[PDB]
Amino acid sequence: MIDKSAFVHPTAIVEEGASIGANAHIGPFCIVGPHVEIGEGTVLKSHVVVNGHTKIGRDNEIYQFASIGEVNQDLKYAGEPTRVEIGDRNRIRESVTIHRGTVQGGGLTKVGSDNLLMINAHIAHDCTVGNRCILANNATLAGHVSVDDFAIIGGMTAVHQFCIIGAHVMVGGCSGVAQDVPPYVIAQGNHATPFGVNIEGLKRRGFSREAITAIRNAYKLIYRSGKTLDEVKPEIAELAETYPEVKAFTDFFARSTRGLIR
Amino acid sequence: MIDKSAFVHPTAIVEEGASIGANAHIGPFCIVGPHVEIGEGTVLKSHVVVNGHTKIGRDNEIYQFASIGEVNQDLKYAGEPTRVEIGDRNRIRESVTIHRGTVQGGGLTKVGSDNLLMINAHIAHDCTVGNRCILANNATLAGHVSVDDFAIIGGMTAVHQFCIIGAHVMVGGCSGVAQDVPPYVIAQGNHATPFGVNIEGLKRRGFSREAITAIRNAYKLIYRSGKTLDEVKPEIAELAETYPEVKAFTDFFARSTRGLIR
Amino acid sequence: MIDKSAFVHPTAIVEEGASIGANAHIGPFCIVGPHVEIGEGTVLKSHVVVNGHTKIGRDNEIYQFASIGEVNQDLKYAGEPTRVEIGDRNRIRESVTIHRGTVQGGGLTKVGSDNLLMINAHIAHDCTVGNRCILANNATLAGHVSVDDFAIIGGMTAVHQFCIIGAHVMVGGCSGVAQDVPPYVIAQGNHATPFGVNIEGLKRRGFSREAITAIRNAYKLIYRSGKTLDEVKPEIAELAETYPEVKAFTDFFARSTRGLIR
Amino acid sequence: WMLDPIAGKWSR
Amino acid sequence: WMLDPIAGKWSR
Amino acid sequence: WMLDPIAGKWSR
């Protein structure tokens, strides 16, 4: 049902069954499917298509020509009732596309809160984007990709299927990410390789001098010590016993399946 | 005229003269020009613009924000009545653009059947796309480009004017194709270079072990023997006398005008 | 107010306060904000969104799914009343986005006349595009970028913030421009580097043999003489005393703040 | 086997 | 001569 | 300091 305080433009089409929260705004020429839930205060500027079993949070701003919850591009998808979940206060720009998941991939494409998805950014089926992330113009996430908190993906960069972009990572524009990127790392080029720690990002997010140094030492263990990953893992876990921020590496390794970029 | 079984949304605008086939579906806010022909069962989700002298086949699914038959981007075009022809069962995703041809280029942009044109794929004036092809996100075909059957063009890849992408070819994402790509070849990088035969693709399409081996031998003649192309041509034609699949090379050479990628 | 000779489609929404010139054409499903000015003869095909304090010149052709004057993507922007100015006879293709400026950047995004902005081209906040330019498919200008007259930016190319693309410059597709490009130069690759003078472009624009030679000599001073930029500046100014076309370099150096690509 | 069209490769 | 804007080059 | 998301870098 549509909340009494929500605004639905006369030219917009909200199908019976859709749930529109208080003070939400559905601009002209928008289409909202019957299985869609739009949270309180969320705004759909105009020309926005939202369908499928999709739940959108509060205070989001979705711009014209964006396509949310739409059928994915996986050739295996056959119309199964999969889903999309989007959090709060996200800024979804013109032409962004966020597709529903596939049964084979888990049936869910998820986006957190406080993210900025710039023009033509693409979030394919079964992706999981965290919070406070930035996908720049034309940034493209292939299916089954994970983008962790605070990560920034440069313009025209494509992340290959199943890859993980660690927390606080910064991927340079015009890049091709074919493997997993540990947290706190700066990567760039096709295929992408590591170029150090995102020090400036960590500074702005409140990390102490000690944590940043610990993180740099962890980085050196992985890419400088020359010791195989399995010999480095226990070393990093050891380091994390004193500097908690380093556990991010540990949690990341447990999820990695594509190997680390090098 | 509009078939009695076709559905035209009240907000859609189908101009008098347009021909809409049986059981076709023209969703909300779509625009269909007077010189357009939409085949039986074809669906235009919503927000789709189709104009110009354009003929679209049966069972196509065209997504929102796609622009079909529109004026091309060639600076020489002056509004001449050129055309676009699209086949059957194509999946044309959000924001795809397929432009009309130019008189100078032949006056026709053609797309076959069973193709998947992913988000923001671009098919410029005078291009010819075959059947069972895949143009990934942001894949861009400049004018006068030919993409043969089963070819797959990676994300963000641009094919330069007049180039030919051979049958069963696979072009890696983030690439720049400046020359012709022989059939069965894998190419990648800017500018693009060859990296072997698309063995997995051939396996999945029913090619026998003998044909794949013959194709690999043909590949070696071109890029390994060290013999000039003109010395290799008769050798490949010879080989094709036993393995027909190899004639694909012969037919390809006859059409090539940009030289082969190397 | 709306001129009596202008056409506004019944489905279009032109908000009170908008100024639409004589013989302008506002196609179906377009949205024109109250602070917008559309010049004489300008055409908005359909599905076009124009808002903000935006002034558009005469005889422009703006295609479907374009977004003009919209809120920019700068995280610092807070809704201040900034502006956009677009000149005459521009061809703005499908999905092009031109965003309003930021107070911090000067409060204005400006585009000249006779430009061709191809599919999905992006002009970020505070950019200044001159006249007779071409931004190819997916060409992306980050904020605060200047693109001088006659410049051509290849497909999928991104120009980094604050950079200047000199007059008559040609940037190859799939490039990443991280520094300033002197006028008359051809640049390509990520990051972009110089590959000579755009001789063919200069020929077609009426430059004499003497001017082209002078320009090539100026180019050699910068990238061949081996003399530091500051030693070369007075040399080029000297050269410009005889060949005025060379002063373009002088004026360019005075504006450069990112250093020259090399 | 997994086809990645965006990457333009067959993955394993 | 042929201008290829997408390629960003003058072709022959 | 200046963040350039499109470039994917922190600029100075």
GROMACS .gro file of C-alpha atoms in nm, chain A:
model
  262
    1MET     CA    1   0.000   0.000   0.000
    2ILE     CA    2   0.094   0.365  -0.045
    3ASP     CA    3   0.144   0.576   0.270
    4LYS     CA    4  -0.083   0.880   0.290
    5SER     CA    5   0.221   1.109   0.319
    6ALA     CA    6   0.396   0.968   0.012
    7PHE     CA    7   0.375   1.153  -0.319
    8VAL     CA    8   0.311   0.963  -0.642
    9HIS     CA    9   0.318   1.171  -0.957
   10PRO     CA   10   0.005   1.131  -1.173
   11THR     CA   11   0.215   1.007  -1.466
   12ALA     CA   12   0.398   0.752  -1.252
   13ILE     CA   13   0.275   0.393  -1.248
   14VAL     CA   14   0.280   0.219  -0.911
   15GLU     CA   15   0.130  -0.129  -0.944
   16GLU     CA   16  -0.110  -0.258  -0.679
   17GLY     CA   17   0.084  -0.444  -0.413
   18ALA     CA   18   0.381  -0.207  -0.405
   19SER     CA   19   0.464  -0.067  -0.062
   20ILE     CA   20   0.564   0.300  -0.052
   21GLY     CA   21   0.678   0.446   0.280
   22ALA     CA   22   0.601   0.778   0.447
   23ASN     CA   23   0.719   1.095   0.270
   24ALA     CA   24   0.861   0.895  -0.020
   25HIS     CA   25   0.851   1.065  -0.361
   26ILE     CA   26   0.778   0.885  -0.689
   27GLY     CA   27   0.847   1.132  -0.969
   28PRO     CA   28   0.696   1.150  -1.320
   29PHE     CA   29   0.711   0.853  -1.558
   30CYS     CA   30   0.844   0.615  -1.292
   31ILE     CA   31   0.737   0.250  -1.283
   32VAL     CA   32   0.719   0.058  -0.955
   33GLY     CA   33   0.637  -0.313  -0.967
   34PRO     CA   34   0.391  -0.497  -0.733
   35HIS     CA   35   0.669  -0.670  -0.537
   36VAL     CA   36   0.862  -0.352  -0.460
   37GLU     CA   37   0.909  -0.191  -0.119
   38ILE     CA   38   1.028   0.170  -0.106
   39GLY     CA   39   1.134   0.303   0.233
   40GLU     CA   40   1.048   0.625   0.413
   41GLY     CA   41   1.179   0.943   0.253
   42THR     CA   42   1.318   0.770  -0.057
   43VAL     CA   43   1.300   0.975  -0.375
   44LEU     CA   44   1.268   0.854  -0.735
   45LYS     CA   45   1.335   1.170  -0.940
   46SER     CA   46   1.173   1.063  -1.268
   47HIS     CA   47   1.201   0.798  -1.540
   48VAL     CA   48   1.301   0.532  -1.289
   49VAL     CA   49   1.212   0.166  -1.330
   50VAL     CA   50   1.198  -0.051  -1.018
   51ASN     CA   51   1.064  -0.406  -1.039
   52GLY     CA   52   1.111  -0.761  -0.916
   53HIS     CA   53   1.110  -0.862  -0.550
   54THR     CA   54   1.297  -0.552  -0.441
   55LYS     CA   55   1.329  -0.379  -0.104
   56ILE     CA   56   1.475  -0.028  -0.091
   57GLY     CA   57   1.558   0.149   0.235
   58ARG     CA   58   1.509   0.502   0.368
   59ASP     CA   59   1.626   0.837   0.235
   60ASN     CA   60   1.762   0.708  -0.094
   61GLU     CA   61   1.783   0.937  -0.398
   62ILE     CA   62   1.746   0.747  -0.727
   63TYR     CA   63   1.800   0.946  -1.047
   64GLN     CA   64   1.641   0.928  -1.391
   65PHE     CA   65   1.701   0.635  -1.626
   66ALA     CA   66   1.815   0.403  -1.347
   67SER     CA   67   1.695   0.041  -1.360
   68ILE     CA   68   1.658  -0.133  -1.022
   69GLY     CA   69   1.561  -0.494  -0.953
   70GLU     CA   70   1.550  -0.576  -1.323
   71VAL     CA   71   1.611  -0.920  -1.475
   72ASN     CA   72   1.986  -0.994  -1.467
   73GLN     CA   73   2.206  -1.064  -1.768
   74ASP     CA   74   2.312  -1.417  -1.671
   75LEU     CA   75   2.231  -1.657  -1.955
   76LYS     CA   76   2.130  -1.918  -1.697
   77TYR     CA   77   1.857  -1.702  -1.542
   78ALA     CA   78   1.509  -1.827  -1.636
   79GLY     CA   79   1.278  -1.586  -1.454
   80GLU     CA   80   1.297  -1.734  -1.104
   81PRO     CA   81   1.171  -1.499  -0.827
   82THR     CA   82   1.506  -1.374  -0.699
   83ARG     CA   83   1.564  -1.053  -0.503
   84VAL     CA   84   1.743  -0.724  -0.453
   85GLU     CA   85   1.794  -0.544  -0.120
   86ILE     CA   86   1.919  -0.182  -0.103
   87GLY     CA   87   1.987   0.003   0.222
   88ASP     CA   88   1.955   0.364   0.334
   89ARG     CA   89   2.076   0.705   0.214
   90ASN     CA   90   2.224   0.577  -0.110
   91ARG     CA   91   2.270   0.813  -0.403
   92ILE     CA   92   2.198   0.620  -0.722
   93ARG     CA   93   2.278   0.830  -1.027
   94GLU     CA   94   2.154   0.842  -1.384
   95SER     CA   95   2.150   0.515  -1.575
   96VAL     CA   96   2.271   0.300  -1.287
   97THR     CA   97   2.160  -0.063  -1.319
   98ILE     CA   98   2.120  -0.300  -1.023
   99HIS     CA   99   2.003  -0.647  -1.124
  100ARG     CA  100   1.829  -0.925  -0.931
  101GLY     CA  101   2.021  -1.235  -0.829
  102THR     CA  102   2.019  -1.585  -0.977
  103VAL     CA  103   1.914  -1.900  -0.794
  104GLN     CA  104   2.256  -2.047  -0.868
  105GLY     CA  105   2.428  -1.751  -0.704
  106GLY     CA  106   2.219  -1.731  -0.389
  107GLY     CA  107   1.915  -1.547  -0.522
  108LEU     CA  108   2.014  -1.204  -0.390
  109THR     CA  109   2.189  -0.886  -0.504
  110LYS     CA  110   2.255  -0.663  -0.203
  111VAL     CA  111   2.364  -0.301  -0.155
  112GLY     CA  112   2.422  -0.141   0.184
  113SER     CA  113   2.386   0.218   0.300
  114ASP     CA  114   2.549   0.556   0.234
  115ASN     CA  115   2.690   0.451  -0.103
  116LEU     CA  116   2.740   0.671  -0.409
  117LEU     CA  117   2.675   0.487  -0.735
  118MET     CA  118   2.777   0.725  -1.013
  119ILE     CA  119   2.648   0.745  -1.370
  120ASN     CA  120   2.606   0.412  -1.547
  121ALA     CA  121   2.757   0.212  -1.261
  122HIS     CA  122   2.651  -0.153  -1.292
  123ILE     CA  123   2.580  -0.400  -1.015
  124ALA     CA  124   2.523  -0.744  -1.168
  125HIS     CA  125   2.329  -1.040  -1.027
  126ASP     CA  126   2.440  -1.179  -0.689
  127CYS     CA  127   2.674  -0.892  -0.600
  128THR     CA  128   2.711  -0.764  -0.245
  129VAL     CA  129   2.808  -0.400  -0.199
  130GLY     CA  130   2.868  -0.280   0.156
  131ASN     CA  131   2.842   0.070   0.302
  132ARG     CA  132   3.008   0.405   0.228
  133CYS     CA  133   3.132   0.279  -0.110
  134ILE     CA  134   3.180   0.469  -0.432
  135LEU     CA  135   3.141   0.318  -0.777
  136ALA     CA  136   3.254   0.585  -1.023
  137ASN     CA  137   3.118   0.648  -1.373
  138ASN     CA  138   3.074   0.330  -1.574
  139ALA     CA  139   3.222   0.118  -1.293
  140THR     CA  140   3.109  -0.237  -1.366
  141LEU     CA  141   3.070  -0.526  -1.123
  142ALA     CA  142   3.031  -0.862  -1.295
  143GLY     CA  143   2.819  -1.125  -1.123
  144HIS     CA  144   2.891  -1.262  -0.776
  145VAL     CA  145   3.123  -0.972  -0.685
  146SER     CA  146   3.171  -0.841  -0.330
  147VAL     CA  147   3.269  -0.480  -0.265
  148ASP     CA  148   3.345  -0.419   0.103
  149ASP     CA  149   3.290  -0.105   0.313
  150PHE     CA  150   3.447   0.226   0.208
  151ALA     CA  151   3.583   0.079  -0.115
  152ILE     CA  152   3.614   0.313  -0.413
  153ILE     CA  153   3.608   0.175  -0.768
  154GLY     CA  154   3.745   0.403  -1.038
  155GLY     CA  155   3.573   0.507  -1.357
  156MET     CA  156   3.534   0.249  -1.635
  157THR     CA  157   3.678  -0.021  -1.410
  158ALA     CA  158   3.539  -0.373  -1.440
  159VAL     CA  159   3.555  -0.627  -1.159
  160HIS     CA  160   3.548  -0.985  -1.285
  161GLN     CA  161   3.306  -1.245  -1.155
  162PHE     CA  162   3.340  -1.375  -0.799
  163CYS     CA  163   3.610  -1.125  -0.705
  164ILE     CA  164   3.628  -0.944  -0.372
  165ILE     CA  165   3.725  -0.578  -0.338
  166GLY     CA  166   3.843  -0.539   0.022
  167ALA     CA  167   3.741  -0.271   0.270
  168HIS     CA  168   3.896   0.075   0.225
  169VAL     CA  169   4.038  -0.033  -0.110
  170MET     CA  170   4.088   0.212  -0.395
  171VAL     CA  171   4.086   0.084  -0.752
  172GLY     CA  172   4.220   0.322  -1.014
  173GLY     CA  173   4.003   0.403  -1.314
  174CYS     CA  174   4.023   0.216  -1.645
  175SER     CA  175   4.117  -0.105  -1.461
  176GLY     CA  176   4.040  -0.474  -1.491
  177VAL     CA  177   4.026  -0.660  -1.159
  178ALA     CA  178   4.068  -1.034  -1.216
  179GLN     CA  179   4.149  -1.142  -0.860
  180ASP     CA  180   4.076  -1.053  -0.498
  181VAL     CA  181   4.204  -0.728  -0.349
  182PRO     CA  182   4.303  -0.737   0.021
  183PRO     CA  183   4.158  -0.458   0.237
  184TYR     CA  184   4.338  -0.121   0.263
  185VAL     CA  185   4.504  -0.174  -0.075
  186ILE     CA  186   4.538   0.049  -0.382
  187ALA     CA  187   4.512  -0.141  -0.712
  188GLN     CA  188   4.526  -0.032  -1.076
  189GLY     CA  189   4.572  -0.146  -1.437
  190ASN     CA  190   4.449  -0.439  -1.648
  191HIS     CA  191   4.485  -0.674  -1.506
  192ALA     CA  192   4.505  -0.500  -1.168
  193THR     CA  193   4.810  -0.513  -0.942
  194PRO     CA  194   4.881  -0.367  -0.592
  195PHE     CA  195   5.056  -0.033  -0.540
  196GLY     CA  196   5.061   0.006  -0.162
  197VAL     CA  197   4.823   0.106   0.116
  198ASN     CA  198   4.542   0.362   0.089
  199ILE     CA  199   4.704   0.579   0.356
  200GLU     CA  200   4.505   0.897   0.284
  201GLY     CA  201   4.179   0.707   0.304
  202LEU     CA  202   4.272   0.554   0.639
  203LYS     CA  203   4.375   0.894   0.776
  204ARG     CA  204   4.035   1.044   0.690
  205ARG     CA  205   3.847   0.756   0.850
  206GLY     CA  206   4.007   0.790   1.194
  207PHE     CA  207   4.276   0.523   1.181
  208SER     CA  208   4.557   0.585   1.431
  209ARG     CA  209   4.923   0.610   1.333
  210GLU     CA  210   4.983   0.272   1.496
  211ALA     CA  211   4.706   0.099   1.303
  212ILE     CA  212   4.824   0.243   0.971
  213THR     CA  213   5.180   0.127   1.043
  214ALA     CA  214   5.055  -0.218   1.144
  215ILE     CA  215   4.854  -0.233   0.821
  216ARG     CA  216   5.159  -0.134   0.616
  217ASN     CA  217   5.361  -0.406   0.789
  218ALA     CA  218   5.087  -0.657   0.709
  219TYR     CA  219   5.100  -0.539   0.347
  220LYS     CA  220   5.477  -0.594   0.341
  221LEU     CA  221   5.434  -0.948   0.475
  222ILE     CA  222   5.199  -1.030   0.187
  223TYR     CA  223   5.386  -0.860  -0.097
  224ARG     CA  224   5.738  -0.798   0.035
  225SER     CA  225   5.847  -1.069   0.280
  226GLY     CA  226   5.845  -1.318  -0.008
  227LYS     CA  227   5.686  -1.576   0.220
  228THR     CA  228   5.400  -1.781   0.071
  229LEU     CA  229   5.050  -1.671   0.168
  230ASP     CA  230   5.003  -1.968   0.400
  231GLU     CA  231   5.318  -1.879   0.593
  232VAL     CA  232   5.207  -1.516   0.614
  233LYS     CA  233   4.852  -1.586   0.735
  234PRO     CA  234   4.952  -1.693   1.087
  235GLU     CA  235   5.197  -1.402   1.099
  236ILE     CA  236   4.921  -1.153   1.020
  237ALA     CA  237   4.685  -1.318   1.267
  238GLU     CA  238   4.963  -1.280   1.522
  239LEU     CA  239   4.997  -0.911   1.439
  240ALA     CA  240   4.618  -0.867   1.470
  241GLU     CA  241   4.640  -0.979   1.833
  242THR     CA  242   4.784  -0.634   1.907
  243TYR     CA  243   4.632  -0.425   1.626
  244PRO     CA  244   4.266  -0.527   1.567
  245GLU     CA  245   4.245  -0.337   1.238
  246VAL     CA  246   4.475  -0.605   1.095
  247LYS     CA  247   4.216  -0.878   1.149
  248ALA     CA  248   4.050  -0.736   0.836
  249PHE     CA  249   4.313  -0.928   0.643
  250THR     CA  250   4.232  -1.248   0.830
  251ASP     CA  251   3.859  -1.221   0.766
  252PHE     CA  252   3.932  -1.138   0.401
  253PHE     CA  253   4.152  -1.443   0.343
  254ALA     CA  254   3.873  -1.668   0.472
  255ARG     CA  255   3.642  -1.538   0.198
  256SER     CA  256   3.892  -1.523  -0.091
  257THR     CA  257   3.852  -1.782  -0.368
  258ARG     CA  258   4.011  -1.610  -0.668
  259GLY     CA  259   4.353  -1.563  -0.513
  260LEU     CA  260   4.514  -1.225  -0.443
  261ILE     CA  261   4.615  -0.972  -0.707
  262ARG     CA  262   4.994  -0.945  -0.729
   0.00000   0.00000   0.00000
